[PDB]
Design a protein around this ligand. Structure first.
Ligand SMILES: Nc1ncnc2c1ncn2[C@@H]1O[C@H](COP(=O)(O)OP(=O)(O)OP(=O)(O)O)[C@@H](O)[C@H]1O
Lengths: 723, 809
């Protein structure tokens, strides 16, 4: 059952799949990216101690450690009240291992020694220095006697060394905590190698133990047991006198950047149409958390993927560093805390901006109150904010003046107006889009350039992709995903010199790619993608593509059909060639062929057919696409040519040219690339859903009764839909 | 000496260099021309080193190079710093300009060298750069210590040393990095340029690489065939270049090995230099698989074009390394050729760093081509596999072995300086024990340590528990030795103020800064017993000197030595103690510091301070000013209530509360918690005193010590004992110690405000600025409801004085 997967310190809550999809007011929580290492939970990564070497002093003190571990264990058992018993009786408090160590069962003795040497080997492994303090003190410190109650029934004498004078340092306490974490890790690793798993309830039948969790999640009971056992271990070591020094603490520089590769921050702005070009304006920014957050005024042309203030498009305040951001950063104001209020005001008809923290004016390095004092009006300003990982903000535009908590303190007297001072309806949000989308390559793009080579009597029409910035300053070297603006649609139902009649009849289309010499062919993937492809991953391989297999058929009479569904059908150019290495005298040509009548996808190497093929579902739209990591100024070149007995791509792309064997590259067809520079519009109203727990027996009711519709504009050639 | 040299120098220094000085701001960003501007700087510095130049020409050189370097980006001129680092220390006559340039460069790039993120958008200093800075720093110490006294030379040496010390990040920089890198440099470093290519005679190629050698010989023949058809050469059975026919355009497969060995020779030299430098080649399965996997006349008109292939960054530095070796080999050959001839001087004889990109082009392309052919065949060259162990990771190599702790150890200059005075004071002479070392210390060490500690204010008091600094915090035993620089307190004895002379102010300012730079918590928790003894011994000595000052002010001693003792107190002892006690009170270090015997000495100090405050004698009449700052500092620092004695048992830090077994009576004690302060101050006594103050018609000029000493006592005292738990739960270990602070301090808020109001009401006043500073922490406690109706009379008194001043003048 699904309730058994709950973490012990959490409760089941039927919440929204999305984060902003809640019908609310200006009090809506704007959320930045979230650190994505939440539920990985248990991944056993123990400290490897098999490689290390045991010094002779630790070697001959090892048996002393093992022995004293034996006495401390029997002391704990006898003081809790255990007694010798052939069978394990927890309720009766009987223990079989409570035996003379020599006569003790050999397997339990191997345990008692393996804990000891693994403990000391871990001590060695994580860099603890072992040194001589006083061998005379080691010889002096002896074991005193114990009363008959502390004497175990087995006849042995628990002999406690001088624990009275032993003191513990905080560094030793910290390394002992590390040792407890490592011991829990190795134990649970062994448990899983036996075959156990985690469960909210302990069940031997299903081999589920709620203790297979990270040490931080581990309950204090076993955690305190490890604490105390390791107290006796470390105090045994200190009584033996070989002093230990743990390595000094290391600062944390990971910066907790665990968001997805698409986003490191999220930008929320007002709509462009709400741009103000003259007057006094004020708005409020509440900071539910304190961290990497910026707030200010942005030009309509501000980019979602760029940090606020890193360019001329935005004037921002960053309280995390107590800085102001516009074409760089300068120290400005103080740093906020949790639950603070930043009032941003712009007085545009004499071109000034000021920021207030909790109603207090913020100053420059000098005594000047003006954050930015000379900016051309241009096309106006709109409220904007940027939030980093695990950051929660709120923007109040002053639609209800009473909601502003510091407008009266600063701004009402100065004559500044709330941004939504007189608006009959709520202002519209726009967010940095999370899913990348294909869009035409800009003519002013920094890195890539697309040139259209007109076809001739000898050369077919082509579209060459080149890197403007290759070999130049700080050029981006990442896998970029290009596609063609127009798809090939497979047949709605599947049937179950080249010949001119065959050309006329056939529904087979061809295109090719030329990977230029000097460009790594192993970094180029060629094939087809659907409109559902949005995976912008720095490391792309043909094994991480999304794929499903839907099997239809009675299980009694076996599966009668299986269909493989995917959004990417490509082959690597280097694997396609594999003629060894080399042979890069001329650009490598890979030809993609699609038979739309049968939905068959085939690929051809430099004159030879490849072994990789695909079969797509009927009515599938396939976009020609190339994924390339640039290792050359000239990377690759789409070629809209044709081969024997195969129609050109333009025939399937355009209905007018359906029966035109002459290859063509009409102006509508162009090269688009996957990008993050797009905006998403928050709906002004969400579905009102009610979620509750009726009872233990009934379950979790969710209810949605009020209808809510939106009008969808469909772009047909891109197979896309927008509001 | 030739007329051409003079005329050329005149032309340069009158037309070229001033123009570059005028257009220096244009050198902001030169990412393209790193080599070009490095060549410019190297040539300019070579002209500076050159002799037979006039003073005006030298000044023009200096100003031009200073402007260019100042406008230049920190990343480049690394080679210029290399040459300066080698040349400045032994130089003491032409080092004026290089020293000033280093000072300006380090002052500009202060953040770049120290801050781990660097300047900002420029990265941080490389390990080689910071090691070079280390070498410069220590070489300048050695040269400055050994050299004789020159006033202007030292006046430049001190700022450069301070700038380099501030720039080098004291926490880690490299911890001397064990410094296993020993990259040989041409003795252009050691004078003029002669190249010394690394010998590869003992190096022999393995019998494994010969497939690669043969294949690159094939590629070399391909390139020479490209020469063939570019020049238009044609196949010929005989050698005749005059008839424009190429000898034997015919494949290496069947060519003789003689000229094939000629092609092989550069390959062998390259690989022998490879192995002599000690990098070795690893072979992948891609390359090895290819090795195992692989018409008439018509030699291949196609060759693999390699300019398209890219190279990794480390391999690029490698290619630059081979390029500089190749240029060294060529320069050496040309040098023997010119030596065999008569005095030849080829323009390209300058070192690789002084070369320009156009001249570096052939060496760079050859090195990149050989590396790219390696990469294509699948052979990867390996750099730090030799001596791959370095053992630092900042874990085994604590602190800074050769900069920070070596600097603080070389502060033993102060200990030997004390020893020198101990030897010399017994009949101080004109020649001194060692006047050179005396002057060196006096004019170098004190300002150096002062500015260094001011710059690294934040680092030393940064701690793991309290993150003062975003970077690494100060280290164990290095905080202890920083405290152990209290040898500067072991010196400056009562009689040594005149012996220092004008340096008394310098040393007391240095001591101010060093005392502000202290970590008492770490010193007591993890410190050496001798250092603890030195600290407690100095504070005991300060208490003893204050008691001696009381014997002086008794008038039984003043009725020479007494006057100089009093002057020592006033000029050093009182301000330095005031600063140290302000620091410990600000950082709450007084609780850890003042425990038992320091507590005894602090009660002695207190009796002294209150005694001089109440001393109406005119001798301390001038001194009453800073006496006020001192007793306020001690009141805000000392951790046991002074004027509340009935709560000594409640207080946990009391001397009796800590050592009531035997030690309190073992030591010299007043035997009673009320007797610990034989002076008058008691609670309601001083309430009533400050109430009647300025209400009984008293005048500052009549008797000013009351409002000059007692209010600052009250100010700092209530400041920190309201730092002691404000409005917590009483009797629960939060106000056992104080309890009574809940309301009387709140009422004497208004008491002191009204006293100030009466002090303004009386006609004349300027001392309240000190009183205003002392009252600053108090008005922080003042809430708005009692700033209303309480600071309005402050405005009334302000306008009253304004009107009176306007009417009078
Ligand atoms: N010689 C021994 N005598 C008693 N207990 C031992 C001995 N050696 C190991 N153990 C501990 O007893 C456990 C046996 O019980 P089991 O395998 O069911 O797990 P567990 O009691 O949940 O373990 P743990 O206390 O480590 O979480 C071992 O996992 C181990 O932790």
């Amino acid at each position: 059952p699904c309730y058994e997967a709950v973490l012990p310190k959490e409760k089941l809550k039927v919440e929204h799949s999305r984060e902003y999809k809640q019908e609310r007011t200006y009090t809506r929580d704007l959320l930045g990216p979230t650190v994505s290492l939440t539920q990985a939970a248990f991944t056993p990564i123990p400290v490897d101690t098999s490689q290390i070497v045991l010094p002779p002093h630790l070697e001959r003190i090892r048996e002393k450690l093992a022995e004293n571990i034996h006495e401390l264990w029997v002391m704990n058992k006898i003081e809790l009240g255990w007694q010798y018993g052939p069978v394990r009786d927890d309720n009766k408090r009987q223990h079989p291992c409570l035996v003379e160590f020599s006569k003790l069962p050999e397997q339990e003795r191997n345990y008692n020694l393996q804990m000891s040497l693994e403990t000391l080997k871990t001590l060695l492994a994580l860099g603890c220095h072992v040194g001589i303090s006083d061998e005379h003190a080691e010889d002096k410190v002896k074991k005193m006697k114990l009363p008959k109650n502390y004497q175990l029934t087995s006849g042995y004498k628990p002999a406690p060394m001088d624990l009275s004078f032993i003191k513990l340092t905080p560094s030793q306490e910290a390394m002992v905590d590390k040792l407890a974490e490592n011991a829990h890790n190795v134990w649970a690793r062994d448990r899983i190698r036996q075959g156990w798993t985690y469960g909210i309830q302990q069940d031997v039948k299903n081999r589920r133990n709620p203790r297979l969790v990270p040490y931080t999640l581990l309950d204090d009971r076993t955690k305190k047991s490890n604490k105390d056992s390791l107290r006796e271990a470390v105090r045994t070591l200190l009584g033996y006198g070989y002093n230990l020094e743990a390595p000094d603490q290391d600062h944390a520089a990971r910066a907790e950047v665990c968001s997805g590769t698409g986003e490191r921050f999220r930008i929320f702005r007002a709509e462009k149409t709400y741009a103000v070009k003259a007057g006094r304006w004020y708005f409020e920014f509440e900071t539910v958390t304190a961290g990497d957050m910026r707030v200010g005024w942005s030009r309509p042309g501000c980019q979602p993927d760029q940090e606020l203030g890193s360019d001329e498009r935005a004037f921002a305040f960053d309280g995390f560093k107590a800085q102001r951001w516009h074409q760089g950063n300068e120290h400005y104001g103080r740093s906020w805390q949790a639950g603070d209020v930043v009032g941003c005001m712009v007085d545009m008809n004499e071109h000034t901006m000021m920021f207030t923290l909790n109603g207090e004016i913020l100053l420059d390095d000098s005594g000047s109150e003006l954050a930015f004092k000379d900016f051309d009006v241009g096309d106006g300003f709109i409220p904007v904010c940027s939030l980093g990982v695990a950051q929660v903000g709120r923007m109040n535009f002053g639609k209800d003046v009473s909601t502003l908590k510091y407008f009266t303190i600063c701004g009402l007297q100065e004559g500044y107006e709330p941004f939504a001072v007189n608006t009959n309806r709520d202002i519209t949000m726009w967010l940095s889009k999370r899913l990348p989308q294909f869009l035409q390559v800009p003519s002013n793009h920094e890195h890539i350039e697309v040139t259209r080579i007109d076809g001739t009597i000898d050369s077919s029409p082509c579209l060459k992709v080149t890197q403007k910035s290759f070999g130049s300053q700080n050029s981006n070297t990442d896998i970029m995903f290009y596609r063609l603006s127009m798809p090939i649609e497979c047949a709605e139902v599947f049937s179950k010199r080249d010949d001119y009649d065959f050309l006329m009849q056939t529904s087979t289309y061809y295109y090719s790619v030329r990977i230029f010499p000097g460009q790594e062919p192993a970094n180029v993937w060629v094939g087809w993608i659907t409109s559902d492809f949005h995976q912008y991953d720095t490391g792309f391989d043909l094994d991480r593509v999304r794929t499903v297999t839907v099997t239809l058929g009675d299980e009694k009479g076996k599966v009668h059909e299986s269909i493989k569904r995917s959004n990417c059908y490509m082959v690597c150019a280097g694997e396609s060639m594999s003629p060894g290495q080399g042979r890069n005298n001329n650009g490598l040509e890979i030809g993609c062929v699609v038979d739309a009548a049968s939905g068959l996808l085939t690929f051809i190497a430099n004159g030879k057919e490849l072994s990789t093929y695909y079969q797509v579902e009927p009515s599938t739209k396939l976009f020609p696409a190339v994924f390339a990591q640039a290792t050359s100024p000239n990377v690759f070149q789409f070629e809209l040519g044709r081969i024997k007995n195969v129609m050109p791509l333009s025939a399937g792309l355009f209905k007018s040219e359906h029966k035109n064997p002459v290859p063509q590259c009409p102006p509508r067809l162009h090269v688009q690339f996957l990008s993050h520079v797009l905006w998403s519009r928050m709906p002004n109203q969400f579905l009102k859903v009610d979620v509750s727990r009726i009872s233990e027996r009934q379950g979790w009711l969710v209810q949605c009764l009020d209808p809510l519709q939106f009008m969808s504009l469909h772009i047909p050639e891109e197979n896309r839909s927008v509001d | 000496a030739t007329d051409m040299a003079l005329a050329l120098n005149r032309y340069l220094c009158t037309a070229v260099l001033p123009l570059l000085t005028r257009c220096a701001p244009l050198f902001a960003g030169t990412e393209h021309h790193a080599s070009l501007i490095d060549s410019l700087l190297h040539t300019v510095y070579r002209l500076s080193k050159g002799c037979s130049l006039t003073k005006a020409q030298r000044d023009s050189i200096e100003v031009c190079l200073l402007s260019i370097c100042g406008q230049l980006r920190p990343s480049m001129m690394q080679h210029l710093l290399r040459r300066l680092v080698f040349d400045v220390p032994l130089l003491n006559e032409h080092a004026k300009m290089p020293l000033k340039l280093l000072t300006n460069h380090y002052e500009r790039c202060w953040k770049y060298y120290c801050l781990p993120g660097g300047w900002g958008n420029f990265g941080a200093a490389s390990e080689e750069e910071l090691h070079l800075s280390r070498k410069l720093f220590w070489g300048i110490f050695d040269a400055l210590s050994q050299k004789k006294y020159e006033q202007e030379l030292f006046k430049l040496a001190l700022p450069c040393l301070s700038a380099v010390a501030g720039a080098l990040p004291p926490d880690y920089m490299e911890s001397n990095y064990v410094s296993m890198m020993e990259k040989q440099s041409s003795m252009d470093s050691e004078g003029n340029f002669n190249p010394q290519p690394v010998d590869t005679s003992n190096i022999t190629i393995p019998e494994k690489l010969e497939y690669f050698i043969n294949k690159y010989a094939e590629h070399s023949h391909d390139k020479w065939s490209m020469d063939k058809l570019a020049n238009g050469w044609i196949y010929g059975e005989i050698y005749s270049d005059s008839s424009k026919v190429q000898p034997l355009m015919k494949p290496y497969k069947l060519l003789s090995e003689k000229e094939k060995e000629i092609y092989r020779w550069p390959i062998k030299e390259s690989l022998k230099t490879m192995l002599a430098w000690g990098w070795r080649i690893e072979r992948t399965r891609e390359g090895d698989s290819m090795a195992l996997y692989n018409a008439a006349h018509g030699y291949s008109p196609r060759a693999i074009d390699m300019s398209n292939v890219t190279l990794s960054r480390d391999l690029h530095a490698m290619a630059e390394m081979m390029a500089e070796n190749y240029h060294n080999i060529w320069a050496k050959k040309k040098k023997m050729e010119l030596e065999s001839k008569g005095g030849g001087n080829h323009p390209l004889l300058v070192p690789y760093d002084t070369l320009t990109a156009k001249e570096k082009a052939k060496d760079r392309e050859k090195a990149q081509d050989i590396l790219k052919f390696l990469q294509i065949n699948g052979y990867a060259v390996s750099r730090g596999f030799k001596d791959l162990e370095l053992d630092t990771p900042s874990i085994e190599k604590r602190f800074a072995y050769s900069f920070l702790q070596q600097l603080i150890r070389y502060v033993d200059e102060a200990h030997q300086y004390i020893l020198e005075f101990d030897g010399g004071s017994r009949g101080k002479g004109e020649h001194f024990p060692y006047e050179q070392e005396i002057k060196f210390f006096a004019k170098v060490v004190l300002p150096l340590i002062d500015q260094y500690f001011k710059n690294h204010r934040l680092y030393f008091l940064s701690a793991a528990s309290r993150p003062l600094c975003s970077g690494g915090h100060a280290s164990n035993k290095e905080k202890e030795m920083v405290t152990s620089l209290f040898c500067k307190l072991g010196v400056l004895v009562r009689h040594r103020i005149s012996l220092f002379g004008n340096d008394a102010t310098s040393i007391v300012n240095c001591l101010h800064i060093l005392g502000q730079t202290l970590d008492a918590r770490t010193v007591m928790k993890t410190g050496l017993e001798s250092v603890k003894s030195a600290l407690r011994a100095f504070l005991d000595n300060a208490a003893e000197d204050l008691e001696k000052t009381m014997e002086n002010l008794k008038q039984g001693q003043f009725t020479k030595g007494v006057t100089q003792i009093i002057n020592y107190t006033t000029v050093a002892l009182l301000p330095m103690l005031s600063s140290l006690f302000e620091h410990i009170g600000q950082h709450q270090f007084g609780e850890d510091l003042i425990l038992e015997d320091v507590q005894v000495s602090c009660y002695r100090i207190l009796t002294s301070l209150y005694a001089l405050g109440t001393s109406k004698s005119i001798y301390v009449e001038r001194q009453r000013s800073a006496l006020g700052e001192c007793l306020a500092a001690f009141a805000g620092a000392f951790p046991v209530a002074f004027l509340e004695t009935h709560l000594d048992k409640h207080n946990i830090y009391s001397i009796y509360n800590t050592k009531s077994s035997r030690e309190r009576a073992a030591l010299s004690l007043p035997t009673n918690v009320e007797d610990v302060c034989p002076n008058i101050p008691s609670l309601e006594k001083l309430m009533e005193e400050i109430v009647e103050l300025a209400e009984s018609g008293i005048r500052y000029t009549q008797m000013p010590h009351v409002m000059e000493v007692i209010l600052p006592m009250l100010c700092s005292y209530m400041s920190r004992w309201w730092e002691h738990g404000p409005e917590n739960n009483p009797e629960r270990a939060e106000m056992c110690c104080t309890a009574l602070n809940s309301e009387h301090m709140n009422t004497l808020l208004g008491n002191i405000l009204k006293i100030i109001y009466n002090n303004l009401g009386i006609d004349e006043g300027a001392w309240m600025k000190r009183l205003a500073v002392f009252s600053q922490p108090i008005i922080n406690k003042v809430k708005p409801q009692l700033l209303k109706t309480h600071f309005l009379p402050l405005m009334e008194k302000l306008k009253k004085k304004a009107a009176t001043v306007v009417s009078e003048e």
